[PDB]
């Protein structure tokens, strides 16, 4: 995991799951800037049609300190909908307390026959 490779955000469980850090990929993906992200909650990416039950699964997972993944619909700054494969993982300290969550986002795109050929024979 690198911040100049990958797309993720870090939430502070001690400051109410406010985002404390976002990677470059996240700003590129969503088109939002730091002023729209840092200190906020990523639920701002949700919008019309976002699945309520998936969002409830995310909420329950965070409440429980559990790892999680799920596809949900999100919205870029210009209002473009995209499918977000969101992976959540808790971060604990020494004591085994959840102090942060990391969230890793993948904008769904078509996986092609070409990419598959590449994958099995790099
Ligand atoms: C580290 C982290 C990253 C998150 N990233 C996203 C995201 O990219 N898109 C999204 O819709 N929700 C994301 N969420 C979920 C929202 O922050 C929120 O937890 C979710 O909408 C359910 O809670 P709510 O019902 O109070 O909104 C993320 C949560 C955490 C903790």
UniProtKB/TrEMBL annotation:
Residues 66-120 form the PAC domain. Belongs to the protein kinase superfamily. AGC Ser/Thr protein kinase family. Residues 1-65 form the PAS domain. FMN binds at residues 41-43, 46, 59, 74, 84, 105. This is non-specific serine/threonine protein kinase. The lineage of its organism: Eukaryota, Viridiplantae, Streptophyta, Klebsormidiophyceae, Klebsormidiales. It comes from the Eukaryota.
């Amino acid at each position: 995991l690198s911040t100049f490779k990958h797309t993720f955000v870090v939430a502070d469980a001690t400051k109410n799951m406010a985002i404390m850090y976002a990677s470059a990929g996240f700003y590129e993906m969503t088109q939002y800037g730091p002023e729209d992200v840092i200190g906020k909650n990523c639920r701002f990416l949700q919008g019309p049609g976002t699945d309520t039950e998936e969002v409830a699964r995310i909420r329950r997972a965070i409440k429980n300190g559990e790892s999680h993944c799920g596809r949900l619909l999100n919205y870029k700054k210009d209002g473009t909908p995209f499918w977000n494969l969101l992976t959540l993982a808790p971060i604990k300290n020494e004591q085994g307390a959840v102090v942060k969550f990391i969230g890793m986002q993948v904008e769904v795109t078509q996986f092609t026959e070409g990419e598959l050929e590449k994958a099995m024979r790099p």
